[PDB]
């Protein structure tokens, strides 16, 4: 019932503790996430990144706690009334023992996407994360929830000039994930972090990661 083994890049970023945002382990050191999360409070001190955590207020085992060595918000992130622009964040994570995470069953990095490569709309992708529901489940949802969303397409996006094109939209029927949480579309059949959750989950608008690779490299190196 601890499903992060499926999708174990998922980083539960808390704020020391309330759950702020999901994240995705791109590297042992670096959790990728949405910035719109932290901009509200931009301090590395503030946030604790969990990994291998399946559950919101229960520390599941295998879960690794990490401080954010460095918080990195996109110098260009813009929060529209609606859309978030360059909503890519970045988190160098350190454990309490001063270390990057270690790959587990429960904790892994998600491949970053091929340089500038995007799934066709209609691809299947997954948004992990507890998600904020009205109608009260009983994975309630402490339990980290993967949800298969189908990529829709830009024009498909229904919001006006959002497409940032540096953004993916995806929606399910019905409709889940967590802002900052990943979206993973199986690429080349090997799993990729296709986009960060920016707005949504009326499809979800995902920061297209493939664009931000330069940013990522530039900040993770």
């Amino acid at each position, epitope marked *: *019932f601890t*499903t992060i083994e*499926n999708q174990p890049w998922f980083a539960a970023i808390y704020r020391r503790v309330t759950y702020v945002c999901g994240g995705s382990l791109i590297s042992p050191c670096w959790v990728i996430s949405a910035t719109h999360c932290f901009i509200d409070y931009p301090k590395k001190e503030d946030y604790i990144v969990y990994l291998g955590r399946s559950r919101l207020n229960s520390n599941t085992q295998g879960e690794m706690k990490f401080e954010v060595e460095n918080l990195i918000l996109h110098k260009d992130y813009s929060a529209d009334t609606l859309a978030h622009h360059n909503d890519i964040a970045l988190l160098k994570i350190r454990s309490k023992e001063g270390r990057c995470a270690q790959p587990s069953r429960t904790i892994q990095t998600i491949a970053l996407p091929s340089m500038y490569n995007d799934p066709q709309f209609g691809t*299947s992708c*997954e948004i992990t994360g507890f998600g904020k*529901e*009205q*109608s*009260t*489940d*009983y*994975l309630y*949802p402490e*339990q980290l*929830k*993967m*949800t*298969v969303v189908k990529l829709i397409s830009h024009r498909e996006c229904y919001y006006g000039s959002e497409v940032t094109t540096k953004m993916l939209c995806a929606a*399910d*029927p*019905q409709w889940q994930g967590d802002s900052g949480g990943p979206l993973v579309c199986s690429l080349q059949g090997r799993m990729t972090l296709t986009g960060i959750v920016s707005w949504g989950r009326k499809p979800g608008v995902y920061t297209r990661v493939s664009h931000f690779l330069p940013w990522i490299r530039s900040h993770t190196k």
Partner: antibody, heavy 117, light 109 residues
Framework: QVKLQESGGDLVKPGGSLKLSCSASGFTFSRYAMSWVRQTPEKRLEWVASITNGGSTYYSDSVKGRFIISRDNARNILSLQMSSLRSEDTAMYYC???????????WGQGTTVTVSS | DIELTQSPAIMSASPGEKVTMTCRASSTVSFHYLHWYQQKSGASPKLWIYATSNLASGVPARFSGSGSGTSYSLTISSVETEDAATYYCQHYSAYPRTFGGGTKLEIKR
């Protein structure tokens, strides 16, 4: 321990209309979605319709349009208003707490609905 | 149209047995929303497993929820006689039928 009481399961003429009540006690109605399911004669279980706590409603392609799920959160009653009833709809009508996406934790004992003339 | 085929439609045999019925969707569905209900004969579907591998209160440790994507399974580790029931796949991502035909578990005696 959350009881679920369908009622108004009854005979009704083809094309006719019937409304099942489901009294929700033992848990906080306002919080939960409620879904209706019907298990047929042949026993295939059909999600009829779901209604989010919010009153937002979702219906099985099977009955959408000719069914309206409704909830009084005042009086904790999931209501399934069926109209344009076809022989199809003849079925054990089960009141579920929860809804499709997250499962239905609790099911009403089920009220039966025969749609025939 | 993302069905949930569910084999076997009906399944059998002995208490102490370890039986597993499959939800096989195809066109793959999230596991978190993959649900198993169990209808005892003449009573109503109890929720059995939710999110695939989660046990609704009361459901005994025997049953366990395994699966991901297209293929999900319900496993009684050891069938007791009170397990005689039909077990339904259910998933919101299954159009038009969120439910599977179910597996009748016929406990052998």
């Amino acid at each position: 321990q959350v009881k679920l009481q369908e009622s108004g399961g009854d005979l009704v003429k083809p094309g006719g209309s019937l409304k099942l009540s489901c009294s929700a006690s033992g848990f906080t109605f306002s919080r939960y979605a409620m879904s209706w399911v019907r298990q047929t004669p042949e026993k295939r279980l059909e999600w009829v319709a779901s209604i989010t706590n919010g009153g937002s409603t979702y219906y099985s392609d099977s009955v959408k349009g000719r069914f309206i799920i409704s909830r009084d959160n005042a009086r904790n009653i999931l209501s399934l208003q069926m109209s344009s009833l076809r022989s199809e709809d003849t079925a054990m009508y089960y009141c579920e707490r929860g809804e499709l996406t997250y499962a239905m934790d609790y099911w009403g004992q089920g009220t039966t609905v025969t749609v025939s003339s | 149209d993302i069905e949930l085929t569910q084999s076997p439609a009906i399944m059998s045999a002995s208490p102490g047995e370890k039986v597993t019925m499959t939800c096989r969707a195809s066109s793959t569905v999230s596991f978190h929303y993959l649900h198993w209900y169990q209808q005892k004969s003449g009573a109503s579907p109890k929720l059995w497993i939710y999110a695939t591998s989660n046990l609704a209160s009361g459901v005994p440790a025997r049953f366990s929820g395994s699966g991901s994507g297209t293929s999900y399974s319900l496993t009684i580790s050891s069938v007791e006689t009170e397990d005689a029931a039909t077990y339904y796949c259910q998933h919101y991502s299954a159009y038009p039928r969120t439910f599977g035909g179910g597996t009748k578990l016929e406990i052998k005696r």
